[PDB]
Enzyme design. Structure first.
Site, PDB file in Angstrom:
ATOM      1  N   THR A 178      -0.943   4.852   0.633  1.00  0.00           N
ATOM      2  CA  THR A 178      -1.309   5.898   1.374  1.00  0.00           C
ATOM      3  C   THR A 178      -1.478   5.234   2.937  1.00  0.00           C
ATOM      4  O   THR A 178      -1.704   4.378   2.897  1.00  0.00           O
ATOM      5  CB  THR A 178      -2.598   6.265   1.373  1.00  0.00           C
ATOM      6  OG1 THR A 178      -2.843   6.867  -0.129  1.00  0.00           O
ATOM      7  CG2 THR A 178      -3.121   7.414   2.209  1.00  0.00           C
ATOM      8  N   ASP A 233       0.993  -1.096   0.230  1.00  0.00           N
ATOM      9  CA  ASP A 233      -0.193   0.093   0.049  1.00  0.00           C
ATOM     10  C   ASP A 233       0.662   1.343  -0.256  1.00  0.00           C
ATOM     11  O   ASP A 233       1.877   1.735   0.355  1.00  0.00           O
ATOM     12  CB  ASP A 233      -0.899  -0.096   1.190  1.00  0.00           C
ATOM     13  CG  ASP A 233      -1.687   1.057   1.037  1.00  0.00           C
ATOM     14  OD1 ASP A 233      -2.623   1.184  -0.064  1.00  0.00           O
ATOM     15  OD2 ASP A 233      -2.117   1.661   2.102  1.00  0.00           O
ATOM     16  N   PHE A 266     -11.910  22.698  -9.768  1.00  0.00           N
ATOM     17  CA  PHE A 266     -10.768  21.660 -10.488  1.00  0.00           C
ATOM     18  C   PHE A 266     -11.586  20.292 -10.803  1.00  0.00           C
ATOM     19  O   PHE A 266     -12.579  19.926  -9.975  1.00  0.00           O
ATOM     20  CB  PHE A 266      -9.741  21.152  -9.684  1.00  0.00           C
ATOM     21  CG  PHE A 266      -9.126  19.978  -9.961  1.00  0.00           C
ATOM     22  CD1 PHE A 266      -7.924  20.015 -10.798  1.00  0.00           C
ATOM     23  CD2 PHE A 266      -9.329  18.761  -9.275  1.00  0.00           C
ATOM     24  CE1 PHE A 266      -7.442  18.725 -11.100  1.00  0.00           C
ATOM     25  CE2 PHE A 266      -8.543  17.672  -9.673  1.00  0.00           C
ATOM     26  CZ  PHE A 266      -7.670  17.670 -10.597  1.00  0.00           C
ATOM     27  N   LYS A 323      -8.224  18.505 -15.291  1.00  0.00           N
ATOM     28  CA  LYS A 323      -7.000  18.779 -14.745  1.00  0.00           C
ATOM     29  C   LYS A 323      -6.400  20.010 -14.400  1.00  0.00           C
ATOM     30  O   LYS A 323      -5.322  20.115 -14.412  1.00  0.00           O
ATOM     31  CB  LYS A 323      -6.002  17.883 -15.406  1.00  0.00           C
ATOM     32  CG  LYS A 323      -5.783  16.323 -15.175  1.00  0.00           C
ATOM     33  CD  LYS A 323      -5.110  15.391 -16.041  1.00  0.00           C
ATOM     34  CE  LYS A 323      -5.263  16.015 -17.294  1.00  0.00           C
ATOM     35  NZ  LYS A 323      -4.820  15.013 -18.250  1.00  0.00           N
ATOM     36  N   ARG A 332      -6.304   3.199  -7.922  1.00  0.00           N
ATOM     37  CA  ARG A 332      -7.810   3.314  -7.772  1.00  0.00           C
ATOM     38  C   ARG A 332      -8.149   1.667  -7.427  1.00  0.00           C
ATOM     39  O   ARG A 332      -9.262   1.016  -8.208  1.00  0.00           O
ATOM     40  CB  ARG A 332      -8.471   3.679  -8.889  1.00  0.00           C
ATOM     41  CG  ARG A 332      -8.303   5.324  -9.059  1.00  0.00           C
ATOM     42  CD  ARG A 332      -7.745   6.081 -10.499  1.00  0.00           C
ATOM     43  NE  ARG A 332      -7.860   7.223 -10.467  1.00  0.00           N
ATOM     44  CZ  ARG A 332      -7.356   7.832 -11.484  1.00  0.00           C
ATOM     45  NH1 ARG A 332      -7.041   7.386 -12.507  1.00  0.00           N
ATOM     46  NH2 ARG A 332      -7.005   9.158 -11.559  1.00  0.00           N
TER      47      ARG A 332
HETATM   48 MG   LIG Z   1      -3.682   2.540   3.337  1.00  0.00          MG
END
Ligand SMILES: [Mg+2]
EC number: 7.6.2.1
Length: 1000
Positions: free
Chosen positions: A361, A359, A497, A502, A712
């Site tokens: 994040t 992972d 935005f 973009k 994603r």
């Molecule tokens: Mg995570």
């Protein structure tokens, strides 16, 4: 667990239900009180090498197959059963205690007679729950009311889907306008929600109010939901619970906890199967030399009983003790502090990992964006040159009351301070009330809020440089200069935005000067043609992107009054029209996006966690392939992959285009196949099509990439990738993650490692191993996993070799005495060799290291040797089988030749020979001596002497105490231990191991 059904949830009425709903409890336990003992027993005895000694001990209930006392096979079995039951129970109790912390968090509940505190585990469907700022949402709710005046809230969802963007949430319009929070119970209203499912990002429902004079009905979407595991960024929100417990969106994206068995244990199980087949053949041969006299089948069973001896039970005891030792060593390591071992039975898995699925994040990054680079073309300012920018701003606003580089810096900083969607939020700090702080622009009370953390980082940097955003509205902005003055800007037009455009733009009027300025900010791909001709945008944008920076191009267009009115008329006209409003509005907007004055480039970094780059380098040098599986967006994932050196600076990157059907996926897979040494960046939507139609081809192309990034990615997709890697490679996978979206792949992997998240603990609670920092992974794999694997290998081979030496000695013993099923060893000798005689010299082995930890960390290529299966294989097993046969034959036949009495004292002679032989084994096998090895061998020799003195049944001490016996036994042992010296010489020289000489 039937078909999921839509529910009607009355607000504040949990009793008004037509179904019993699950308790709002998060559970990571494998068993409960009822399934514990059957589950543990079945998980133990469903494998051949446990059922083997179970049946060996059970066959002693038949006197014909009896080889001695009943307890001889049940005291070790009782010990094994007690150890496994106690270990499983301790793991279950630890899991329960650790889940209690999350389940016992306290929230406030709206009741008729006032707010009442409620624990998270007692929250029911229909409760009105209050969640405070920075507090985790305990159950799935519908946003009803917020105390913030904007009538909205921000959610952090990185623990739910790994996305760094904050989600804007809107309450139900009817409930937000109520005079007080107590009015929610005074209205007749309900929510018609869909059935529970795994869709984190989509929700369908209706809110109805029945007591209103016109019947109020409102459609609900994901914009009105607060899922469990999200965190409220600001304000105290009120929600109504829809789903609890196992029906939560985060929980429904996880699997049931399961018992994991390591690959090493499966290999030992196969070895035991091979040994059992071989001993069956040997027994068939040995009763054939009896000419099948008498009950031949009883003879077969008796010989099988004799030849097995302690093969399965001693293996189990010593392997269990070793695993306990490995987990003890991991938990006590101060160089990886806070490491938690939940699956104590699989530490050898960490030594044979081929794929690390990580992972993004919260696992590689700290979830803290920071401004890094301001590039103005001629000059670029880094973290070490921010005082220069501060001085430029200060000089501008000092000479204001009392082109140049200072003017350009000021223009860039003002553009960064104005072109965004960031709102300052003031909160009371006790000394200063919020209303007082919001009027005085108190610095300590101010917090910056936006959907994009990059914009918040930009605004924070601009404040740190001299220009502070101190107030915002839908039509006004306020900036504070270094001279403490306030500049007011009227927001005329806002162009928010979108991930398709973009870019983001704003038109403001400077009330001090009256000038109208159009500011635009966006990615270089879309802003390279919007700005005036230059010679540095592309090159410097590429340079900044190569460092893992999020690059934005900031442009400016000074508009005259008449130009603005002319644009505004057309923009209003296009907005009013309903015939393709989007296209005309877009055309009118891009009517302004041309020949814009390029101001600067901005670089924002998503800060990695400590020593992420060296850890990834070490894992790559160890032969481990690393894939990044993230729920976050493509651009952030690519920036982090370049920043963390997951992709090398000069490495090619192929971004898989969006595909929707079989043909598009085939074409893009061909396009990727036409590339070499290219990293793969693919999105979950295209990955779905590829795995649906071309799973084999996609897997074969992805496993030959230098690195793969899946962005994603849903939790189910992460688990599917892990499962597909396991199926199509046959190798071990390690999944590392910090959020609830990582739980499925952590459970799916052969070795789950959960990082303790800042705002969540589900991944750590569900994982086999829990660490506090990603950098601990390197040591946990290179030192502890490697040592566990190698020590288990040496342990198991030593135990098997001892058992087979005893088996060969028993075969010769039976051959000498007319091939009768008379035991060579019985009584306390069998019990001791099964349990206590074996634990000392192999505890000496579980203390052994081939190299120091620093050497193992410095030279990751030692890991790739283990990745080949070197520590245990059929080769080493065969050599040890031959050595055991040779040693048993040598001991028995040397006893026959040297001792004038043939076999009357054979038990004593063989026992003494085995004692000296195992002392020579341990002396010659250990590579790095430890003082505890000397202590353990002294204890073993004491136990052997105590057994010799106290076992009058088969040992005559006065026969042992003799110089003739001493020299005869010494010669027998020296002749028997010849392969030991040969192996020791080959290891010492003439075939040196690669781990020894690499240091110097
Ligand atoms: Mg995570």
């Amino acid at each position: 667990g039937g078909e999921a059904r839509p529910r009607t949830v009355w607000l504040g009425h949990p009793e008004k239900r037509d179904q019993r709903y699950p308790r709002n409890v998060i559970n990571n336990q494998k068993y409960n009180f009822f399934t514990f003992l059957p589950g543990v027993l079945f998980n133990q005895f469903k494998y051949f090498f446990n059922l083997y000694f179970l049946l060996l001990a059970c066959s002693q209930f038949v006197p014909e197959m009896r080889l001695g006392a009943l307890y001889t096979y049940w005291v070790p079995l009782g010990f094994v059963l007690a150890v496994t039951v106690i270990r499983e129970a301790v793991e279950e109790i630890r899991c329960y205690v650790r889940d209690k912390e999350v389940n016992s968090q306290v929230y406030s509940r709206l009741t008729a007679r006032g707010t009442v505190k409620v624990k998270s585990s007692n929250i029911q469907v229909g409760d009105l729950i209050i969640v405070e700022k920075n507090q985790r949402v305990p159950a799935d709710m519908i946003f009803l009311r917020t105390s913030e005046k904007n009538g909205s809230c921000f959610l952090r969802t990185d623990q739910l889907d790994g996305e760094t963007d904050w989600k804007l949430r809107l309450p139900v319009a009817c409930t937000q306008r109520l005079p007080t929070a107590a009015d929610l119970l005074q209205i007749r209203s309900y929510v018609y929600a869909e059935e529970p499912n795994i869709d984190i990002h989509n929700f369908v429902g209706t809110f109805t109010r029945e007591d209103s004079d016109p019947p109020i009905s409102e459609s609900l979407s994901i914009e009105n939901t607060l899922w469990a595991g999200t965190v409220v960024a600001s304000g105290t929100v009120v929600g109504v619970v829809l789903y609890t417990g196992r029906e939560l969106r985060s929980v429904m994206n996880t699997s049931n906890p399961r018992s994991k068995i390591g690959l090493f244990d499966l290999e030992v199980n196969c070895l035991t199967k091979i040994l059992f087949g071989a001993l069956v053949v040997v027994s068939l041969v040995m009763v054939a030399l009896q000419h099948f006299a008498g009950r031949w089948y009883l003879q077969i069973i008796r010989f099988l009983l004799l030849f097995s001896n302690i093969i399965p039970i001693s293996l189990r005891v010593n392997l269990d003790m070793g695993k306990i030792v490995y987990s003890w060593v991991i938990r006590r390591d101060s160089k990886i502090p806070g490491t938690v071992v939940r699956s104590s039975t699989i530490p050898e898995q960490l030594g044979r990992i081929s794929y690390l699925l990580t992972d993004k994040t919260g696992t590689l990054t700290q979830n803290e964006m920071i401004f890094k680079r301001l590039h103005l073309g001629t000059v670029a300012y880094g973290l070490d040159s921010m005082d220069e920018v501060q001085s430029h701003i200060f000089s501008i606003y000092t000479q204001q009351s009392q082109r140049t580089m200072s003017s350009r810096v000021h223009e860039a900083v003002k553009a960064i301070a104005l072109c965004h969607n960031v709102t300052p939020v003031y909160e009371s700090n006790g000394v200063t009330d919020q209303a007082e702080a919001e009027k005085q622009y108190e610095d300590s009370c101010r917090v910056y809020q936006a959907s994009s953390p990059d914009e918040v980082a930009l605004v924070q940097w601009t404040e740190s440089v001299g220009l502070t955003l101190v107030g915002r509205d839908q039509s006004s902005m306020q900036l504070r200069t270094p001279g403490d003055q306030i500049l007011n800007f009227t927001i005329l037009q806002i162009f928010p935005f979108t991930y398709e455009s973009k870019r983001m733009g704003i038109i403001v009027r400077d009330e001090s000067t009256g000038e109208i300025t159009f500011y635009m900010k966006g990615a270089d791909v879309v802003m390279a043609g919007i700005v005036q001709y230059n010679d540095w945008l592309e090159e410097e944008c590429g340079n900044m992107a190569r460092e893992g920076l999020r690059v934005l191009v900031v442009a400016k267009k000074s508009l005259a009054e008449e130009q603005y009115q002319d644009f505004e008329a057309r923009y209003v006209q296009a907005k009013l029209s309903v015939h393709d409003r989007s296209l005309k509005v877009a055309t009118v907007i891009e009517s302004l996006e041309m020949e814009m004055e390029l101001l600067c480039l901005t670089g924002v970094e998503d800060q990695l966690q400590a020593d992420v780059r060296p850890t990834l380098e070490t894992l790559r040098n160890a032969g481990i392939k690393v894939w990044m599986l993230t729920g976050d967006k493509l651009e952030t994932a690519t920036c982090t992959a370049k920043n963390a050196h997951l992709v090398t600076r000069n490495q090619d990157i192929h971004v898989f285009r969006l595909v929707t059907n079989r043909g598009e996926a085939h074409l893009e897979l061909n396009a990727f196949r036409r590339k070499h040494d290219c990293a793969l960046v693919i999105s979950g939507d295209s990955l779905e099509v590829c795995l649906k139609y071309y799973e084999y081809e996609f897997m074969e192309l992805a496993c030959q990439c230098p690195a793969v990034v899946c962005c994603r990615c849903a939790p189910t997709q992460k688990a599917q990738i892990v499962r597909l890697l396991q199926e199509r490679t046959g190798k071990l996978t390690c999944a590392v993650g910090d959020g609830g979206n990582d739980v499925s792949m952590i459970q799916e992997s052969d070795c789950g490692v959960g990082v303790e998240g800042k705002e969540g603990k589900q991944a750590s609670l569900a994982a086999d191993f829990s660490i506090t920092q990603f950098k601990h992974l390197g040591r946990l794999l290179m030192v502890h996993g490697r040592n566990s694997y190698k020590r288990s290998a040496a342990l198991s081979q030593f135990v098997i070799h001892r058992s087979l030496c005893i088996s060969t000695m028993q075969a010769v013993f039976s051959s000498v005495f007319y091939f009768a099923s008379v035991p060579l060893y019985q009584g306390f000798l069998i019990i001791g060799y099964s349990t206590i005689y074996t634990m000392f010299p192999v505890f000496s082995l579980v203390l052994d290291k081939d190299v120091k930890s620093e050497v193992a960390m410095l030279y990751p290529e030692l890991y790739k040797d283990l990745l080949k299966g070197r520590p245990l294989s059929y080769k080493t097993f065969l050599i040890w089988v031959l050595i055991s046969i040779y040693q048993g034959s040598t001991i028995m036949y040397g006893a026959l030749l040297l001792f004038e009495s043939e076999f009357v004292h054979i038990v004593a002679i063989s026992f003494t020979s085995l004692i000296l032989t195992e002392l020579l084994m341990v002396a010659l096998t250990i590579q790095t001596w430890h003082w505890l090895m000397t202590v353990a061998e002294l204890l073993s020799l004491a136990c052997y002497i105590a057994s010799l003195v106290f076992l009058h049944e088969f040992i005559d001490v006065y026969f042992i105490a003799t110089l003739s016996f001493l020299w005869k036994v010494s010669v027998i042992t020296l002749v028997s231990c010849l392969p030991l010296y040969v192996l020791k010489y080959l290891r010492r020289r003439f075939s040196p191991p690669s781990y020894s000489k690499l240091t110097s």
